[PDB]
Amino acid sequence: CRHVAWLGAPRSLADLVLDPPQGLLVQSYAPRRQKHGLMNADGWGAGFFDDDGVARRWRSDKPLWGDASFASVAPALRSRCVVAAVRSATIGMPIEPSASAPFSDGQWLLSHNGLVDRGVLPLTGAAESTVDSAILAALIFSRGLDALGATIAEVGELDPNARLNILAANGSRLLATTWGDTLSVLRRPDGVVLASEPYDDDPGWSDIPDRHLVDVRDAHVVVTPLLEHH
Amino acid sequence: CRHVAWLGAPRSLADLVLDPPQGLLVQSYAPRRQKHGLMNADGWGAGFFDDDGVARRWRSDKPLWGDASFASVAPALRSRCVVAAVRSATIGMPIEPSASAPFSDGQWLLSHNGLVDRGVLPLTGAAESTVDSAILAALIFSRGLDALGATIAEVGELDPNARLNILAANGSRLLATTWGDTLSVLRRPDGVVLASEPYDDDPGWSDIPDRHLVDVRDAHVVVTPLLE
Amino acid sequence: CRHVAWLGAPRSLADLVLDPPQGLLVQSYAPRRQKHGLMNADGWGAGFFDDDGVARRWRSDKPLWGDASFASVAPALRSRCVVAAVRSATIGMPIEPSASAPFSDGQWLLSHNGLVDRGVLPLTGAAESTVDSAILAALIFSRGLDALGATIAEVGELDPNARLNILAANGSRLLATTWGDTLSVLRRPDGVVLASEPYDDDPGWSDIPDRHLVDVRDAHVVVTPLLEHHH
Amino acid sequence: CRHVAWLGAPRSLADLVLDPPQGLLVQSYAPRRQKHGLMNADGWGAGFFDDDGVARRWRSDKPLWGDASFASVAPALRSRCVVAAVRSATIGMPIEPSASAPFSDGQWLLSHNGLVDRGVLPLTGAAESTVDSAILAALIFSRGLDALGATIAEVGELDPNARLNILAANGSRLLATTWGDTLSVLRRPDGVVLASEPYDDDPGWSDIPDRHLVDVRDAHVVVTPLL
Ligand SMILES: NC(=O)CC[C@H](N)C(=O)O
Ligand SMILES: NC(=O)CC[C@H](N)C(=O)O
């Protein structure tokens, strides 16, 4: 998977996802920094918060490059807070809109890039899908996003092979983790981008080291380490 | 099919299509005034003009009632000019998003409710799909919406079994025809609705007589007959 | 939902599902004895056992009447044991192929017509989907189809409002429950049909009374009452 | 796009399309000899003739690798004559099952790998889709597969940039053209394969030169230049 998020002044979905020369659209068929998966063609999703702060989502199980409706409508959807993803399905996982990021508890939008043994996660009746990412999202939501770091560190310990890159937002805050995959940040004059990989070659892009938490709010970018549990 | 259109102050797609108690969503599984088709479950479409007058469209080949994305996003899409439809596919026609109304030439959005023998329509290289409605739209667009009435009257003469209900918009104007199916109008304080059937029991709803052209602008509604 | 099953001599999926005058295809837009749901257009599925006894499935989240591929290929798929369904999705449930019956554990194909509070079913890591039917299917598979009756009676006690019509097959046997919705049986000279609705006006159709178990194998059809639970 | 055809003893769709190590399934995400298109994820289709000579088709607008129904059912579908394809949609063309090869007139199945300007093709009321391949298929069907070579050379003259690789079958015969994309042939003991690219490294694979017609029937493979 690849994901991207925005927090700042109103910005269109198209401008964040479709229009950049190396953005999410391009990453659906030609990602630049993706170790696992050669493409992300098993669906996509775009979540945003409207002027009333309500979480809304558009999701699909088809390749992003092929969706004429999204290409037509995305430029007219503007938001101060966005989380979007393109999916590379793990073999054996369902391919269906409910399995595409972002997931939601109604307050937070959440994307997962990676892989985790569902066997180390609690069983749940509150997941949006059976895909490992959805089971993980349900866990994260149940513990609360203020405990994201602890949740990820604990799951990382239970499954040493897991990749646990999270990117989440609630309308006025971004939260992200690096845990076995890539993340970069870009400060703009009017807001902040977090992304699996830079959507262009802006010298402003800065890479987030592995096993860290990123916390974006009130024009602050707060980066803290995730300490292994033992 | 059933379609609906709005011209006026900004209105959300949800408020026009999903939220009314007998609106397009309800009509996808339980239309009230539809002689042909017991439902409209073969897709749907919503076209609108943004604040810059650009026509934009969201189309599907699935039942409207099942689309979680549209239900989630539609309340946040507001427009001064909307044309939306739910589809009942004629047996033998393809079911695919390209075949769902509204069609567009970039300037006009256009929906067709009815049926026409493609044999009486010109072959075209400008159709969005192979369905009869797309071939008809191509003809209408080619002749110009300024000649919508003449186009429909001519096609109606060539195919006397055809039903030719059109509903179209360009961002500042609505155009529609009744030709063998239903249409009604509702004048609101902040705009005008044209619809295959009323989306509630507002006593302001008024039915458009058959074989007529409807022209909506600047808070005017002009109804004229389609002559031979 | 509506479902249908066949156990007998080879029969094409088309002949069972598409071709009868009021069969599953017609039931997708115009069911004749369905109290809950106007139609069944939220997907469909056809499972069958091939000549090696392998369960195979074709499933969709689109209306059966519009699927040209299935209309074209179904006449060429023949089987001695078939379970097929058309779906009416409960509001709030996902609409996606994984949520369409039949579900499978590799040995059994299973369809559910009805509705159940997922809150009274065990958590599971073995469900195909989050839809209530998939969670119920997982429970049924886990307890074993030989305990189908007890499983359904127990769930029925836990959710007094639940409808729990099951139709299942393993290649050599059909199992079914009536629990708040319709089922009929037709014995042909070459096999047995179980179906939510008769697919024609054959005078051999007979209706299964509510709260009963149906067991078809070795050309026997055995119908037994299911006692309610009061634990 | 990439396509493959079989003419011979009964073969399962899975054995031809899904199971080979570099076959159509793999080509949907990792084609080996494809100049135009990184992959073929914009749909797929499998057409075959049943025991009574009836042409049947299963088509999709989704990536082949993700279709669980086809993966489950394909091993149970056997045929003496198959034409299958994975689609790489030209930008601006519709993505929908009717736009996926193979197209059919009821007697012939037909797949197109390439691109042609629809302006050089006659308008038609008999096309399955508005995609260029469907308009081209309608023309080819109208002129007759017996004139396949003439039609393709004619269209190629009108659109000098067109790529016009056709692969077609009627249950007892394969016909194919190379016109700006790849094709190979494998002769098996029990039949013949034509394919955009070899589905394995069988030493029997041989490549068809460009601007040629291939005609497979009665266990004979005849390759002739298009002039
Ligand atoms: N590559 C990934 O990020 C995969 C995410 C998750 N396992 C899925 O199948 O969707
Ligand atoms: N009932 C109708 O309005 C059918 C419209 C058109 N013939 C179609 O197939 O979509």
Ligand SMILES: NC(=O)CC[C@H](N)C(=O)O
């Ligand atoms: N009416 C029914 O049979 C519904 C079955 C199940 N609740 C579903 O959503 O698929």
Ligand SMILES: NC(=O)CC[C@H](N)C(=O)O
């Ligand atoms: N690359 C190709 O073969 C494209 C074929 C055809 N132009 C299509 O869009 O399907």
